[PDB]
Amino acid sequence: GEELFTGVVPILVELDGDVNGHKFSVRGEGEGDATNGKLTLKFICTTGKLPVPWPTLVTTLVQCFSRYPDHMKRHDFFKSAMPEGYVQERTISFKDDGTYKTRAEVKFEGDTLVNRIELKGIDFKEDGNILGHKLEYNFNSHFVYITADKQKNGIKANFKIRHNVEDGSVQLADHYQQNTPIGDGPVLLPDNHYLSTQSVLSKDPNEKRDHMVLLEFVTAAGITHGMDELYK
Ligand code: NA
């Protein structure tokens, strides 16, 4: 629950991926400050050069660090499932191109929040925007729409990621997401709401490996009951 996130929490991220047969691994380390909604992470492709653009992996590479307003805390499924954790699965459909399917487990190893991911990508075009590395190294702001999934005792989400392309166009990546708690502990199943996300991608000038430095800010919104400063 909430008590596990009141301070700064170390994060580890591990990703094993296969896109069109290209096998790669990514490791990340950093920390999260859920009280402010802030993540700071650095990711390295430990197998060598990454075969897809780093921005395509941002959403896959810990929504338990979202800042939920006080009046919305009872709608925070992600923290409610901690420390035992949750499974997060997605299908990501790149318009006019291939698809990623991802399965991750997000849980605590003691003080550290760990996101361990398997990713499979298929049907990508060899000189599409992904395998052709035509996406700009930057990231837009989005809304993540959450609803409860009673049957699976978890949540579903949907959203559309917009990836800038180097020729000025936009590459859409449609996200379908399901989260299921690990084990049988009680959880908070929320009313419909959304996350508001913002991200900054950068590079470490002293890092020669293929890598991504990430700053991310996420808050929850879409419910107003109990937010008394809004009465005025
Ligand atoms: Na919360």
Q: Which domains does the chain have, with CATH numbers?
A: 1-232 (2.40.155.10)
Q: Cα–Cα distance between 95 and 191 in angstroms, integer?
A: 30
What is the 2 CA–ligand 1 centroid distance (Å)? 5
Question: Which distant-in-sequence residues (6+ apart) come within 8 Å of 222 by Cβ?
Answer: 192, 193, 194
What is the 66 CA–ligand 1 centroid distance (Å)? 8
Q: Where are the beta strands (DSSP E) in 34-111?
A: 38-45, 86-94, 99-109
Question: Which distant-in-sequence residues (6+ apart) come within 8 Å of 98 by Cβ?
Answer: 19, 20, 121, 122, 123, 124, 125, 128, 130
Q: Cα–Cα distance between 66 and 132 in angstroms, integer?
A: 33
What is the 79 CA–ligand 1 centroid distance (Å)? 6
**Greatest Cα pair distance in the chain:** 58
What is the 168 CA–ligand 1 centroid distance (Å)? 38
What is the 35 CA–ligand 1 centroid distance (Å)? 9
- Give the tokens for residue 192: 């419909």
Breaks (C-N over 2.5 A) in the chain follow: 61
What is the CA 71 to chain-centroid distance, rounded?
24
- Give the tokens for residue 202: 């950068």
Resolution (Å units) = 1.6
Question: Which distant-in-sequence residues (6+ apart) come within 8 Å of 43 by Cβ?
Answer: 13, 26, 27, 28, 54, 57, 61, 211, 212, 213, 214
What is the 158 CA–ligand 1 centroid distance (Å)? 20
What experimental approach yielded this model?
A: X-ray
Please state, in angstroms and as integers, the Cα–Cα distance from residue 219 to each residue in 26, 65, 119, 138, 141, following that order.
Answer: 26, 9, 26, 20, 12
Taking alpha carbons only, the member of 155, 178, 157, 163 closest to residue 57 is 163
- Give the tokens for residue 67: 């800042």
What is the 77 CA–ligand 1 centroid distance (Å)? 8
In this structure, is the dihedral angle defined by the CA atoms of residues 203, 206, 209 and 214, taken in order, positive or negative? negative
Question: Which distant-in-sequence residues (6+ apart) come within 8 Å of 29 by Cβ?
Answer: 10, 11, 12, 13, 41, 42
What is the 83 CA–ligand 1 centroid distance (Å)? 14
> What is residue 45's three-state secondary structure?
strand
What is the 80 CA–ligand 1 centroid distance (Å)? 8
Q: Cα–Cα distance between 29 and 217 in angstroms, integer?
A: 17
